[PDB]
Design a protein around this ligand. Structure first.
Ligand SMILES: [Fe+3]
Ligand SMILES: [Fe+3]
Lengths: 147, 146
């Protein structure tokens, strides 16, 4: 492969809320954190205060927070990295991901930008199973199962 | 492994322009195209008209267009950037050079007019480079020495 996917950056308004939820939901473990930045990093992410590299499966997730006064929601209309899709290994795991989401939502340990619950697990013309959930930032994750 | 990254969705306001730039810049190939959607898809992406799966490297990109507000918003929670690892320092130079070649070609329109950053080196020799796609979305190229 000419290149390889390395990490996705997740910008949040509440880093500690996101870190806790990502660890419990995805099983992320922390590889490092950073609070001192290059000029270049600060020019791409003005006001960044803390950055953490998380890891789950093959996925690296850099979660960071920038100094801000307000806490806006995501804007659905604008060009964007709109969703991230993870593949599961069985229809049973799809149900488990859905149940685990509701369990974390009902636990009262996290704040969520949106009130929206998970979709049902749906099947398409080819047997593919789909599930969409939102992280605590209102960002969309898709779970899929490929027969 | 509990799960595996499958694809990233990129939402655009001009699908044709994105398809061309992603193909030329990343070497993507169009695996398939779709213009008929399930009720679930239409509920998550109201107004979606066309969806395309592109493949480059070990990455699947689902580029899609809904209704023809431009410009990403920088302050909101978001998937803020995607980082791709390269194989050599010379390839970092190449990615920068090829970004500029495409930008200056006139073949594409860009939401923002910002050029690529310099290539910078951290205390461990790791190289970083940032560019924007035609939608103004950020791509990071890195090189991590052995
Ligand atoms: Fe998707
Ligand atoms: Fe990054």
């Amino acid at each position: 492969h000419a290149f390889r996917f390395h990490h996705i950056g997740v910008q949040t308004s509440d880093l500690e809320n996101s870190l806790g939820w990502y660890r419990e939901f995805f099983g992320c473990e922390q590889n490092w954190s950073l609070e001192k930045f290059s000029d270049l990093t600060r020019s791409r992410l003005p006001g960044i205060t803390r950055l953490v590299e998380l890891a789950a499966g093959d996925l690296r997730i850099h979660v960071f927070e920038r100094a801000a006064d307000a806490t806006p929601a995501p804007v659905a209309e604008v060009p964007q990295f709109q969703h991230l899709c993870l593949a599961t290994r069985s229809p049973e795991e799809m149900t488990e991901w859905r149940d685990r989401w509701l369990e974390l939502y009902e636990s009262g340990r996290y704040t969520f930008v949106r009130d929206e619950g998970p979709t049902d697990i749906v099947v398409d013309e080819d047997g593919v199973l789909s599930l969409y959930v939102l992280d605590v930032n209102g960002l969309e994750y898709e779970f899929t199962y490929l027969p």
